[PDB]
Design an enzyme around this catalytic site. Structure first.
Site, PDB file in Angstrom:
ATOM      1  N   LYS A 139       7.565  11.308  -1.093  1.00 50.39           N
ATOM      2  CA  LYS A 139       7.523  10.963  -2.512  1.00 50.39           C
ATOM      3  C   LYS A 139       8.949  11.109  -3.070  1.00 50.39           C
ATOM      4  N   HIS A 190      -2.222   1.812   8.584  1.00 51.57           N
ATOM      5  CA  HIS A 190      -2.555   2.240   7.255  1.00 51.57           C
ATOM      6  C   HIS A 190      -3.609   1.310   6.652  1.00 51.57           C
TER       7      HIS A 190
END
EC number: 4.1.1.39
Lengths: 440, 86, 106, 142, 440, 440, 106
Positions: free
Chosen positions: F156, F275
């Protein structure tokens, strides 16, 4: 600088590169010191002396200014003649020759304005280049077109037409009796008309017109592109479609790309039309920049079968038209040819007269350029009251009436009006075109 | 003229923006091909709205776009469709 | 206004009205003047893709009269009247063809 | 030309390409007619009207001169501001942008001298290009 | 979340990507907080604030919810409009845009159900995509098909036919007067019929039917394959055979493969038909998923000349047909168009109406879609009492009798029956067809 | 339809492909007729019977509905089990299987809502697929990681970080003791950070962290790209840099691209992380769409070493974790496994638990997933009061303290708190982490 | 049931009975209303692979009456009676061809 770089008694070698520079020195600066400075700045000259210079023969790679003459009837303006050794330049590189000669001098402070007028390429240097992929003689052979100038036409409007609408206009022009049609300079691959569509419909327009008339037709497909990879992709497709000829904008696209393409054109037997887009940025002003005569010379080396030269100063044009056509051009200042240039059997480039010409200009253009030229009638064809095909026929009758009358011994300057008027009597297409455009 | 349009013209003139206008017929509209109307060279609210009403009546059955114009930067600050054929 | 008729053409001077013997001679006079060597060519077809036509006899190298070529055009006409006949010139200095115009159509 | 190409009340779009030209008109030529002429010569303008033009939307691909101002303290010298539609240009091509803008106007006769001063590249056009292979921030990192 | 991400006073930039979401908030959760959360979870929003966040400009990459409205005549259902900065997206990637917008939000817990209704692609972004390989206009040019919708047909049965018998069916369909035939969605390369055999026999059916009729014929060869290398192998062989058109199932095969293939199509002049197999997994339910309109817009960017649209909510369909055909589409909520959308001269995609339609629908379909569409008659062609070829003729006569009637000014809704009934009087093929299927 | 397609007495062959659908029939339509129609519309079923059908064996390619049952404790909801012959499918193609099963049925009108719950792939079909490039067992071998789940972390913020600062974050995370870091789903090649820079700086972060620690480190480099050629370009560069692992978004990028890449991975020994971005568009709603279990099974065929599975309905998740890990899975309806499934020695896929988990979840996650899983701590690592590296150590200690406690026989549900509390006494990094996040 | 005959077609409206002058006028009225520009094309053959037919004069741009087109079809018939004649139409705003239908078969 003057003690080293101004060598007024130096007589150049046949292996030297020679440059003619027109310059104005800044007030206070003498012409001799200014000429010496051009020689230094375009070769080796620098503000400080370094130790590494003593590791080399400094005199060897030195540009010498061997002549300075004042320009007749123009105050504070001089010609400098500068000689460069053959060791200065990379073989086969127009890019290097420019970077070497014009790379720094133009930003030099003691000069008010500098303009490069002529370059003499030594034969030893000329042999390292490919030259035109085909040249004049081979081009006429490949298209079976002898004894007259070749006829062209640019499709208008410049932007807007769909690929299919474009091809229609092409077809109608070509069936009418033009040898070539061309893409406009700025037609590349826009959203209204993608390149591969335009190539496809134009290829088909050529087939129909060639099958109708029975003469070889072509269209200068613009292969100018953002990358060398895109350019080759376009040129290759034009080959696949069996197109005789392609075009490139050598100034905007640059010399490296152009040379790449000219090599490809030799290897794939495709003629190469060269457009001079952006030239007037460099070549228009008398006092500063590079005269077109020089850029023409570079292009003959770089590679190009055709080159735009404009329509008709008169004498300056006639000069550089010889430079791009002939094998040996003797130095003649009336025509602006500063140096005697030999081309060592490198083929010539066809000049293309283009823009703002109609049927009344025909006898003049034949008299000026002769048979080794392309003449281009953008609005001259499409502007005809009856459309592209009768428009093209009108040009083609006008041209062939002139050529015939030239060969018959009639003076094309005095009788030119009568020649056209006579051919108007049996050609209704021409008679219509002779009514529309006013006599020049 | 509707109340929503007047409110926008009021807002733009108070912010010192000029009012611009362009029209397009049903066919041109689809290709986003616009044509400029007779220019409203006024700042006075009464004069601007009077010229806009005169503009819409002239281009009946045509798409009319209103433009907010920053005159310093020569940029469009605002675009709104204010008329449609029906 | 008129629509252009579809017509097959044969390169140079093929948009002019077909050349009279006097007109052909005048063109040959030009070639003698420039020092080009006239050659008469003929073919059954005129396809743009084909480079060569059949050569009638040999090029007239030391050509001084235009009548000398006209006589060779007249001969080829009687021998191959069903054919297209063409007059071609040669520049020995530039080492290339310089002239090529049609003279007879079948 | 002036009736078509000089549009002093046109306010450019964010998608337009904008060019600033410094020019001197030849004696006798007014600045407005000269600016209009730059707009035409750099876009579509031509000496004759052809039938094929009626097959297309002519107004669409037209360079508009939207502002002419005199250069302060320099006689017979003006700035022209010209707007070009985004449809004019090939995506990702600097070659095309130059050929389009600077390809013809500089040889135009009624102009004594022309100099291109600034171009506004619209964001819609900028996104089609790669840009620098790395740029400033990445270079210092590397 | 509300303080940061819900910004009702924000006016969206022209460079912004705009998304319209329909949502139901879980009982307790208010609409404003839930709207802000859709903006957060689709952009940056996370459960914890980390130190690395302070190394970057946080506000810059943040999705803003600028409007929330309750859906009219529906309880606990709201529209949230979200703006996203242009920076967030990889240029020319549908994959990235979807991954960015729809990647997470749909599994958000405080929302009962989420549906993405519309996306505004900004012009800056649109220009990074190729778009359709050809588009509507180029495609009519390539096929010489003007002033009428194009007719198609799907070969039944779905599975079972040998490649030779397949081609036979194709040939009979095309010779009767259809423009296209198509492979079924699930026809790929099974044991009963291997792809390369099918391509070969279909190519021979096209040649025979084209020569007999003198019109350009095609068949959408399904190049959907297990890998990209296999897909390209099939596409390449279709080009080798000189096939005008191919098909692809973009939703099953994915966007990356689709974008690959549309680039290949542009480069090789092949037309790309797009089949929307698997769409109703995503777009059927009103409450959850992605509305087709969004997928259509995404396809127009990714590339495709044709796209299945369905047959005929009516106003919704008329809405996204405009989104896939036009250059400029004004926001019209009645037609389900949420944002005004400019395509910046990206070409349109031809809508393909298919499924359970016959001759009696023909007048309505012409009134609804108009000339720029493909109408597909699977059983409407093969189900004809006399077989494929007269079956095709029946459809083709029906179509051309409608198009003529429309242009003549006749109302295709009131007179649609009479138009067909009249054309049945001189066409025995059509009269047969009008008797088998009952009037709608 | 019922007479032909609803065959309650049919016993499915071992070569059959079996599909379990959950459906609601529209009021009026009975379950049996609706079940038969799901079988028809997903196989061959069409509105008309054409002459070409008689040129083929019709019964052969027909989908049979062999069982219908009402869903327990739900009104107007039924399970239909459908058998499909092996012949229907292209070998080694997920694309074709989906196109064939889910291509049309979902938009069927007589059904209110349809959901595909499970698919049985027959062994004959399974053998035509590559499966995972490596699988669970080979992957532990390649990484020297035995007897514990692997730890990951997502960097992040999602967007904003320069490539160098990105690598810095990566490096600090990996040096603290995580096995992997990963690119975010939507991180591809934006202006703020171009892919090739990121790959370069990440590779240097891996080298530094690996040398310091002496353990194999990796980072899932996102190679999801707009075209297949771009994807391969990225994959190839990751191999050049000697990266052990890459990631792909299979649902957004599509199955064809995914199958392409998994073949490439096998050939180049690279591990493939998958993913599941965009999954909740399809799999969230109970009533409509495709349950994830089916997509997981499809991925195991297409290829992928890791797959995101979620964190913890519990029994459903424990159900499809077995389907993606084991060789043989018995039918267990409580765990949502509808059919018994054999993988015929196709390797397992590692499940990846991710999303809003921290140190306190660690004991529960070890009890749930066991040693063959990847546990991902985005904010659990970066959100640590002391930063990434001690953040990682805190997680790693927590994990190894649990795994030790599990093996020692301790109950990770009753003692899970005490286990961490005890390990906090000697690990200051963990004690800090246990104080910041509250016990679950 | 009947077997369909093998027959050459010529795109739009060629599956209809040959258009009468009144029907041709009706189609032109449609083009005038749509603001398309009528163009008459003629060709000796009709091959699907060929894009172009020869333009008869120039597209009627300021076309107001259909009679103006019919008169130009009448003229092209007398001059090229052995050819296929077609009516093409142009949308200058969409910048494409919009109409193309046959009016005469030799």
């Amino acid at each position: 600088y003057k003690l080293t770089y101004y060598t007024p008694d130096y007589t150049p070698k046949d292996t030297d590169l020679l440059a003619a520079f027109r310059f104005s020195p800044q007030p206070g600066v003498p012409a001799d010191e200014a000429g010496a400075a051009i020689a230094a700045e375009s070769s080796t000259g620098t503000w400080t002396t370094v130790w590494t210079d003593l590791l080399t023969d400094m005199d060897r790679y030195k540009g010498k200014c061997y002549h300075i003459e004042p320009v007749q009837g123009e105050e504070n303006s001089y010609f400098a003649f500068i000689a460069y050794p053959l060791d200065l330049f990379e073989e086969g590189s127009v890019t290097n020759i420019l970077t070497s000669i014009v790379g720094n001098v133009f930003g030099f402070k003691a000069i008010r304005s500098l303009r490069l007028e002529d370059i003499r390429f030594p034969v030893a240097l000329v042999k390292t280049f490919q030259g035109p992929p085909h040249g004049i003689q081979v081009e006429r052979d490949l298209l079976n077109k002898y004894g007259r100038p070749m006829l062209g036409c640019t499709i208008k409007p410049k932007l807007g037409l769909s690929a299919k609408n474009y091809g229609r206009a092409v077809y109608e022009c070509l069936r009418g009796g033009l040898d070539f049609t061309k893409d406009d300079e700025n037609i590349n691959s826009q959203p209204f008309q993608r390149w591969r569509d335009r190539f496809l419909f134009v290829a088909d327009a050529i087939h129909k017109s060639q099958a109708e008339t029975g003469e070889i037709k072509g269209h200068y497909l613009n292969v100018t592109a953002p990358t060398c990879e895109e350019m080759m992709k376009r040129a290759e497709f034009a080959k696949e479609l069996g197109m005789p000829i392609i075009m490139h904008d050598f100034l905007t696209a640059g010399f490296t790309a152009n040379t790449t393409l000219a090599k490809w054109c030799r290897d794939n037997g495709v003629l190469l039309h060269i457009h001079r887009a952006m030239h007037a940025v460099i070549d228009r002003q008398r006092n500063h920049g590079i005269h077109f005569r020089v850029l023409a010379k570079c292009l003959r080396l770089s590679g190009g079968d055709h080159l735009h030269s404009g329509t008709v100063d008169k004498a300056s044009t006639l000069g550089f038209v010889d430079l791009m056509r002939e094998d040996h051009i003797e130095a003649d200042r009336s025509r602006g040819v500063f140096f005697t240039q030999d081309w060592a059997s490198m083929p010539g480039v066809l000049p293309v007269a283009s823009g703002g010409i109609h049927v009344w200009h025909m006898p003049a253009l034949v008299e000026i350029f002769g048979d080794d030229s392309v003449l281009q009638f953008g609005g001259g064809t499409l502007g005809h009251p009856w459309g592209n095909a009768p428009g093209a026929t009108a040009n083609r009758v006008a041209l062939e009436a002139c050529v015939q009358a030239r060969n018959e011994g009639r003076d094309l300057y005095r009788e030119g009006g009568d020649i056209l008027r006579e051919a108007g009597k049996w050609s209704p297409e021409l008679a219509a075109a002779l009514d529309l455009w006013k006599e020049i | 003229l509707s109340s929503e349009v007047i409110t926008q013209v009021r807002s733009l003139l108070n912010q010192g923006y000029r009012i611009g206008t362009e029209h397009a017929d049903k066919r041109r509209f689809r290709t986003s091909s616009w044509q400029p109307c007779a220019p409203i060279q006024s700042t006075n609210e009464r004069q601007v709205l009077s010229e806009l009403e005169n503009c819409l009546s002239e281009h009946e059955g045509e798409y009319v776009r209103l433009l907010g114009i920053d005159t310093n930067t020569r940029s469009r600050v605002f675009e709104a469709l204010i008329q449609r054929p029906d | 206004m008129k629509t252009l008729p579809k017509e097959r053409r044969f390169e140079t001077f093929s948009y002019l009205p077909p050349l009279s013997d006097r007109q052909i001679a005048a063109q040959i006079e030009y070639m003698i003047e420039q020092g080009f060597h006239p050659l008469i060519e003929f073919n059954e077809h005129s396809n743009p893709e084909e480079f060569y036509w059949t050569m009638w006899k040999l090029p007239l190298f030391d050509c001084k009269s235009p009548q000398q070529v006209l006589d060779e055009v007249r001969e080829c006409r009687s021998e191959y009247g069903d054919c297209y006949i063409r007059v071609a010139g040669f520049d020995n200095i530039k080492q290339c063809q310089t002239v090529s115009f049609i003279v007879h159509r079948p």
